Paper text:
Polyglycine hydrolases (PGHs) are secreted fungal proteases that cleave the polyglycine linker of Zea mays ChitA, a defensive chitinase, thus overcoming one mechanism of plant resistance to infection. PGHs are composed of two domains: the N- and C-domains. The N-domain is a novel tertiary fold with an as-yet unknown function that is found across all kingdoms of life. The C-domain shares structural similarities with class C β-lactamases, including a common catalytic nucleophilic serine.
In the present paper, we discuss the structure of one of these polyglycine hydrolases from F. vanettenii. The structure was solved by molecular replacement using a RoseTTAFold model. Fvan-cmp consists of two distinct domains, the N- and C-domains, that are connected by a linker. The Fvan-cmp N-domain (residues 13–262) consists of four loops, five α-helices and 15 β-strands assembled into a distinct tertiary fold. This distinct structure, as shown in Fig. 3, is comprised of five quasi-identical structural repeats consisting of three β-sheets and an α-helix arranged as EHEE with β-strands in an antiparallel assembly. The Fvan-cmp C-domain (residues 271–616) consists of seven α-helices and one antiparallel β-sheet and resembles a β-lactamase fold. Fvan-cmp shares the same nucleophilic serine found within this motif. Fvan-cmp lacks this glycine and instead contains a phenylalanine in the same structural position. We showed that Fvan-cmp retains two of the three conserved β-lactamase motifs and the core active-site αβα fold but lacks the associated activity.
Author numbering: 13 to 616
The structure:
């Protein structure tokens, strides 16, 4: 639990301190090598706790390191730290091998490009555990070490190549704007380039400093120690006068464990308690394997909830999901648009046959766009193929920049429509269907245009019948204390501030959508229960009353599924789409949960 740190020590001092700390029940959790290969310096962190046997090496040339690596590999040991300093031909190496059980690990110190590490790892997702960009600027070499990502941990590392240098301040700001995201390591090269790695695991309060002299580091370590933060990473770079340090501090030595929580009741089943045990077992296996933190399952019969199970597999700093919490619905949002158009047609305010752009007063660049009717947009047969021409729903930034205001103002729904009506169709209306986010955007504008009511107002008054279905607002700052965390590793350029260079999280504009203009297509949020209830009297797919079909949505931060099968309706919400693969999700929604509904009947 006690944390011992040293930095700016030579091989001989490292070896003395190592032998004494180890003999007094410490294990090495961080090793950095830096400086000149003829006089390398070391920074190390040691934690006083029990654990498996380990081996360390330092001042090792390539031959000695590879021989020692291969030797301890052959004895079941696993590389957990790797560092190198100097020109390729002349480099010295340091490392830690541990007697741990890791299925698959990978390491190369011969990479000339860090992106080449994927060829080493094949089809296996890894968490990078060790790194050093060594060599020289003209002849760059990389040590990269990765462990198989058991638990599907969410991580990033931003590499610098001979042809691109990471701006550390802007990367650090972008990555830590994502909720719970924190530095794991701040790797540092001899030419003072930071290669930072991030995680959304929790070590309590944390802090960091970069570009520190040993004097500044010593002060910073004392400052943080008084506050009860201890070093979890330390990295040196440079020799002599230009020696500098990165450091990350945390309250804890290791990530908090996740804890399992379930809320809600199954009420309308033959054997309610045996139904809970089985579906809990299914969801628990899925969430543990895929590292999913927050999820909901719900069954409804004729618009009435007969089952709700809300699931948390999360550290104690994530809210415990309840059945009435709301999840970003992504393209499940579309069934509310279909219901809105159904309302307008059956109240004689619109026809399936109504030509849309003539109704709006637009003169398309494509004569064929004059034939696009309400039905074409419901069916996605209107002529918009995003595989050919890209997806307008994620082009708000590029669209705003094309305006006369030249990116000073965010693009509106109307701006996207005007942009699209001035571009050709990809195909003749009605020839085939191509799944389109844009088609229900244009129909959401038609709803406002015909009624003079904002789409959200129209939904509350005439469609939702008091269901808590809400716009998921774009801005990250509106979501910083939300119970439900919409999780993505991803960041992108900001469509709300189209002249800003600063990357925003994927669920908060990073994916390229302004959610305020996408209520009709994927920007709504609701409970699984609200979904299961709604599809009881509305088409889950297509337009009209209840049908036997299903609908899903995928955005950065969200996965949702709803299905009407037989007499009942069921829904599933996840706080992520970054589960392991589609095959994990498809198995859950197409075998596991349907096979549960078969094996556990509703009340007789
Ligand atoms: C249904 O959708 C259509 C298509 O979007 C929409 O028609 C558009 O309405 C706007 C008004 O909101 C029209 O824009 C006007 O165009 C005239 C010239 O033709 C301009 O001079 C107008 O300027 C006024 O407004 C400006 C902005 O506040 C001010 O800068 C200025 O001082 C003026 O007061 C104005 O821009 C637009 O031409 C149509 N577009 C088409 C293709 O018809 C329609 O209003 C929607 N209907 C409903 C009921 O919502
Ligand atoms: C929906 O369809 C009906 C029937 O085609 C349309 O009603 C017609 O409107 C046009 C234009 O004003 C008239 O010339 C016809 O005489 C109307 N027919 C009838 C039977 O009333 C209606 O305009 C369409 N709605 C929309 C919004 O396009």
């Amino acid at each position: 639990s006690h944390v011992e740190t040293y930095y700016s020590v030579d091989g001989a001092t490292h070896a003395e301190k190592s032998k004494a700390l180890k003999a007094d029940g410490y294990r090495i959790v961080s090793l950095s090598s830096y400086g000149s290969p003829d006089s390398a310096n070391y920074a190390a962190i040691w934690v006083q706790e029990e654990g498996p046997s380990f081996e360390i090496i330092h001042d090792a040339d390539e031959a000695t390191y590879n021989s020692w690596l291969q030797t301890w590999k052959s004895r079941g040991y696993v590389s957990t730290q790797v560092s190198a300093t100097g020109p390729a031909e002349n480099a010295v190496f340091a490392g830690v091998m541990e007697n741990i059980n890791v299925a698959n690990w990978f390491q190369s110190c011969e990479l000339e490009n860090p992106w080449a590490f994927s060829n080493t790892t094949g089809n296996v997702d890894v968490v990078v555990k060790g790194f050093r960009m060594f060599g020289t600027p003209e002849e760059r070499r990389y040590c990269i070490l990765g462990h198989e990502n058991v638990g599907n941990e969410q991580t990033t590392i931003q590499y610098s190549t001979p042809s691109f240098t990471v701006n550390f301040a802007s990367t650090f700001e972008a990555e830590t704007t994502k909720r719970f995201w924190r530095p794991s390591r701040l790797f540092l090269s001899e030419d003072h380039i930071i290669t930072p790695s991030f995680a959304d695991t929790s070590v309590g309060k944390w802090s960091h400093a970069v570009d520190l002299t040993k004097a500044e580091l010593k002060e910073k370590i004392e400052t943080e120690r008084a506050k009860g933060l201890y070093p979890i990473d330390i990295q040196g770079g440079g020799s002599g006068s230009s020696e500098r340090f990165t450091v990350v501090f945390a309250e804890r030595t290791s990530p908090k464990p996740r804890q399992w929580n379930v809320r809600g009741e199954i009420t309308g089943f033959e054997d309610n308690k045996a139904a809970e045990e089985e579906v809990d077992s299914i969801m628990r296996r899925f969430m543990e394997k895929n590292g999913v933190r927050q999820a909901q399952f719900a069954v409804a019969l004729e618009g009435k909830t007969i089952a709700e199970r809300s699931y948390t597999w999360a550290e104690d700093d994530r809210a415990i999901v309840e059945p009435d919490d709301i999840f970003l619905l992504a393209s499940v949002s579309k069934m509310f648009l279909h219901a809105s158009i159904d309302w307008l047609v059956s109240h004689d305010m619109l026809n399936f046959s109504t030509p849309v752009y003539d109704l709006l007063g637009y003169k398309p660049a494509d004569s064929r766009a004059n034939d696009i009717n309400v039905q074409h947009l419901l069916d996605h047969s209107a002529g918009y193929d995003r595989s050919m021409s890209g997806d307008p729903s994620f082009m708000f930034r590029e669209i705003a920049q094309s305006l006369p205001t030249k990116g000073a103002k965010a693009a509106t729904l109307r701006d996207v429509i005007e942009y699209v009506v001035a571009k050709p169709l990809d195909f003749t209306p009605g020839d085939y269907s191509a799944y389109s986010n844009y088609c229900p955007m244009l129909l959401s504008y038609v709803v406002t245009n015909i009624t003079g009511v904002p789409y959200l107002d129209f939904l509350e008054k005439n469609i939702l019948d008091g269901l808590n279905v809400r716009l998921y607002e774009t801005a990250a700052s509106k979501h910083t204390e939300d119970r439900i965390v919409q999780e993505s590793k991803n960041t992108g350029q900001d469509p709300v501030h189209p002249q800003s260079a600063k990357l925003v999280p994927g669920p908060h504009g990073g994916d390229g959508a302004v959610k305020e203009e996408c209520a009709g297509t994927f920007a709504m949020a609701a409970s699984a229960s609200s979904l299961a209830k709604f599809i009881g009297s509305h088409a889950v797919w297509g337009t009209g009353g209840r049908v036997s079909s299903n609908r899903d949505g995928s955005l950065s931060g969200a996965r949702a599924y709803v299905e009407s099968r037989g007499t009942i309706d069921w829904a599933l919400t996840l706080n992520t789409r970054e589960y392991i693969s589609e095959t994990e999700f498809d198995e859950l929604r197409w075998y596991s949960l349907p096979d549960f509904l078969s094996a556990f009947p509703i009340a007789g």
